[PDB]
Structure formats: structure tokens, C-alpha cells
Amino acid sequence: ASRLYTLVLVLQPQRVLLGMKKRGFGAGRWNGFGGKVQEGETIEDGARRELQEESGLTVDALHKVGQIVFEFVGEPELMDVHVFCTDSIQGTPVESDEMRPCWFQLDQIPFKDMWPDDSYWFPLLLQKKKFHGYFKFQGQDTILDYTLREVDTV
Ligand SMILES: CNc1cc(N2CCOCC2)nc(N)n1
Numbered sequence: 001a002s003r004l005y006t007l008v009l010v011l012q013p014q015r016v017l018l019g020m021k022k023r024g025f026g027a028g029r030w031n032g033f034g035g036k037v038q039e040g041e042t043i044e045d046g047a048r049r050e051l052q053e054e055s056g057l058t059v060d061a062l063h064k065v066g067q068i069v070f071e072f073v074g075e076p077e078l079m080d081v082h083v084f085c086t087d088s089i090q091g092t093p094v095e096s097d098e099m100r101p102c103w104f105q106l107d108q109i110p111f112k113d114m115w116p117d118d119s120y121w122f123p124l125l126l127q128k129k130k131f132h133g134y135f136k137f138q139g140q141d142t143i144l145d146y147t148l149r150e151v152d153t154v
Pocket residue numbers: 005006007031032034035036070079081115116117118137
């Protein structure tokens with residue numbers, strides 16, 4: 001049993017866009033933009049929708065860069081997160097009720113205030129490598145097990 005999620009990182013040559021989640025799941029942490037995939041939309045449609053809802057941004061093209069599966073102890077559904085990246089965006093990021101966006105220089109990524117798994121796979125993202133990851137969480141702070149490998153096809 002799994003549920004589809006999206007995560008979108010706007011990565012430009014010297015900077016990456018992150019949003020500070022202000023309520024709900026993962027509140028109080030920086031992350032890319034995204035969320036649940038709905039019935040009746042493709043995964044990529046969902047990524048675009050969440051990007052627009054959370055930042056006002058639209059994009060020309062989204063590129064598949066990763067897939068990460070999360071298990072939370074005691075929770076029946078696995079989280080199947082499809083991770084996308086893009087360089088060219090359309091518009092200027094604006095704050096939503098969900099997210100407060102900011103640009104970060106690539107050597108100033110706030111890992112201590114991000115999901116812990118990001119510390120493991122974000123470098124691969126910045127190095128433009130495609131990846132498959134798995135992280136087992138107890139609660140929201142503790143990684144119990146994980147696997148991470150580069151792949152050819154996401
Ligand atoms: C559990 N560690 C997570 C979860 C997550 N999510 C973003 C998309 O919605 C599903 C949860 N994003 C990151 N970077 N790490």
C-alpha cells in the first residue's frame with residue numbers, strides 16, 4: 001500500500017528555491033513544493049498544481065530527478081514521493097498559506113531545518129544525478145533505516 005506524492009525543486013546555477021511550510025505535515029521545515037497526487041491528474045500534473053498553489057509559480061518543463069519511498073513506523077501507507085527539478089520558472093515566487101518561499105545559495109542549504117533525509121539525497125540532486133531512495137522513519141526526526149542509489153531511469 002502506497003500513496004503518490006510530488007516534490008519540486010527549482011534549482012538554478014547558483015541558487016535553489018525552498019519554501020518554509022507554515023502548517024500541516026512537515027510544518028516548520030524548509031522543503032521543495034508539492035504534496036498529494038489527486039485522482040484524475042498525472043503525477044506531473046500534481047507537481048505543477050502544487051507548485052502553483054504553494055508559490056504562484058508555473059514552469060515550462062519539469063524533469064524527473066528522483067523517487068523516494070518513506071515508511072513511518074505504525075503508518076500503513078508508504079509515501080511514494082516523485083521528485084522533479086527545473087531551472088527555468090515563470091513568475092516570481094509569492095507566499096501562500098502553506099509556504100513562505102526563499103532562495104538559498106547552494107552552499108547555504110538549511111539542512112538542520114529540513115527533513116533529515118534531505119541531507120542524504122539533496123547532494124545527488126545538486127550533482128544532477130538521478131536517484132532512488134528509501135527511508136524508514138520513527139516519527140518525524142529519526143531515520144531508522146535507509147537505502148540510496150543512483151539510477152539511469154527514475
Ligand atoms: C519524510 N521526508 C520527507 C518528506 C517530504 N515530503 C514532501 C512531499 O510530500 C510528502 C512528504 N519531503 C522531504 N524532503 N522529505
